[PDB]
Symmetry: D2
């Protein structure tokens, strides 16, 4: 697909799908009742889109999808809502699904925004967590991979809206984003 | 296991869905293989085609870009809740849909996207129902021609449920009445 | 004139309203003579007429921001265009009834960390006494009856009235 | 007294603007006189204008707002119309038509929703609108190409609240 753009492969597709399977079961166990309402997966477009469709099928309990679209005002990160949730999450069991957590600013904003909507419960699942995100103010119950601070693309991760479609996660060549 | 007593029968198994998407991927890949230096742009309307587009994109052997539209209902009269994140002017664009039934949404979408002047505009849907086989909008890629059964699974919903299924199943009448 | 038979009685005439707004503008202008302009935040659509008249009655520089919401506790359809961090902000509302909308809005804006946050409503109804958000500026206190005009609607109609009046029971 | 030293001269006073809007409303009211006339505005330069105009139009009128933004002459819709304008008499309301590209987009977008009638009212029109192709049934004032602020018109979000329209002195830029 992208010859000369990917410097190396950090996480193979097989590794990714394997980890999601275990995350899927672990999440399935923790959420396996009294409420009668399905688990609610909340995704912020669009880097976590590939991840959430796979995670959802790996979680052995019913799961609903909800999507948020956001933009930055510039420089918890300060965040503008382009598309709000389609439904009220009041009293719902909610799982935030992120592609990567780096600074922690987005997730910090998201956790607060969703909290004041008063869900029954709020937890966080991220496929990737970078070193600066370890020891952050928002608790992340489910972490797929603890990765180094390398700029990576693939499996939903982009540089300039490219490389999102890769099935694996690879380190991008410094030439590309110079 | 997930929804016991709700699925009346399986219309399309997961193995069958992934198989057809593999063929679709190749077929799409060869067409758009045939200078511009810009990637193929996949455009999805949330939320039912979300699962489909993430599989299709990985099955298409040429670079693909993701864009998402969110719409709502008030000729297909449609309200936009979230416009495209970028200008698609001069881009080669593939509309990705979960199901085409009356063809009303697709008519609205095709014309809405046409006036943004893309280089090209084609449509790919996983499912097509009888009433849509002779609709005014041309669909270059059809995964399956299914009957007019109300189906769920693989992105398809009833009251926001059943989207997470890996297969496409017919839903029991008790559930939606 | 515009809607014959639809308005049972006038509540607030055009002149009553503009005079009150002239007063409000002066009171707000005195309070905010503080280096960024006062930021008026309005929720569409009811307070649109009000906020355009109010902004012109305020003798200090004022900027406009609009939000668009919808009830599912409300869904944001159009967010603010700018980071209100460090800004002096005035929420402008048409009517405060149950107070729930103001409650949500107040909390939403507060977590964006403005320097100051106050509320101005044209109309306050009796049920607002059971709400908890402080309102620095009130145009008029009115009874419980459903009113239309000056931005207030019944099924999108009557917003263009220059006065506020009670709706005839025949319309329901 | 609002922005001391920023305005070099007044182009259109508050009184002059209101008088013209009064004429506009009557003219528009006469033309449209069983569903209410729909005024459609793009946020937010024309908000002041549309609130005054709606009150000056002696027929029942309704408001609908749109919010757009430029993709980094086509625009991104941020807030769409709240209602279906199918079979409705629609009047687009603008603050200023300059290049005509904004109005060009908006007019095409609303046409495809099939209103019964579509017309354009703008408070101000600049000389370059002569090459815009899109017809305007109601113009408040034809004005020079010079940059003006006030009555909804901004310079980096300032000066919108002015009751009059005026010229900024080059010190501001
Ligand atoms: O390695 C990486 N490869 C790609 N992206 C990366 C990487 N690391 C951080 N990021 C950016 C992710 N961060 C910003 C994400 N988002 C904000 C982009 P912006 O609004 O332009 O500042 C991108 C949305 P999308 O999925 O559509 O690309 C959020 C993590 P945090 O710093 O808030 O904890
Ligand atoms: O078998 C089905 N199972 C689930 N849904 C089905 C089925 N058939 C049609 N549909 C509904 C598909 N519809 C797609 C969009 N629908 C919502 C998109 P989604 O978020 O993916 O569920 C309906 C819009 P609204 O409910 O607001 O009127 C219209 C297809 P068309 O008739 O315009 O060609
Ligand atoms: O007399 C009245 N005349 C018109 N409207 C009236 C009146 N009283 C309450 N209301 C409704 C005001 N409500 C405003 C909320 N908005 C939500 C209306 P809905 O989506 O139908 O629930 C109004 C949107 P708009 O400005 O477009 O008309 C609630 C204020 P509060 O109860 O949270 O304090
Ligand atoms: O004298 C003027 N004073 C203020 N603004 C002026 C003036 N002349 C043109 N303009 C810009 C008006 N422009 C209106 C579009 N918008 C410009 C977007 P931007 O590219 O970010 O400056 C205005 C949004 P708002 O109403 O919120 O301020 C373009 C009109 P047109 O060239 O498409 O016919
Ligand atoms: Mg993310
Ligand atoms: Mg990114
Ligand atoms: Mg669809
Ligand atoms: Mg549906
Ligand atoms: Mg209000
Ligand atoms: Mg109302
Ligand atoms: Mg304008
Ligand atoms: Mg401007």
């Amino acid at each position: 697909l992208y010859p000369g753009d990917i410097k190396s492969v950090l996480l193979t597709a097989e590794q990714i799908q394997a980890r999601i399977a275990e995350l899927g079961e672990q999440i399935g166990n923790d959420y396996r009742a009294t409420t009668g309402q399905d688990l609610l997966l909340i995704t912020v477009l669009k880097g976590a889109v590939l991840f959430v469709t796979d995670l959802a099928r790996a979680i052995p309990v019913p799961t609903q999808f909800e999507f948020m679209a956001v933009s930055s005002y510039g420089s918890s990160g300060v965040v503008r809502i382009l598309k709000d949730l389609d439904r009220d999450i009041h009293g719902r069991d909610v799982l935030i699904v992120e592609d990567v957590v780096d600074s922690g600013l987005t997730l910090s904003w998201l956790s607060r925004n969703l909290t004041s909507r008063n869900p029954r419960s709020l937890r966080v699942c991220t496929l990737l967590r970078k070193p600066d995100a370890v020891h952050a103010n928002v608790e992340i119950a489910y972490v797929g991979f603890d990765i180094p601070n390398d700029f990576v693309v693939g499996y939903g991760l982009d540089y300039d809206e490219r490389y999102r479609d890769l099935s694996y996660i690879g380190t991008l060549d410094p030439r590309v984003y110079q």
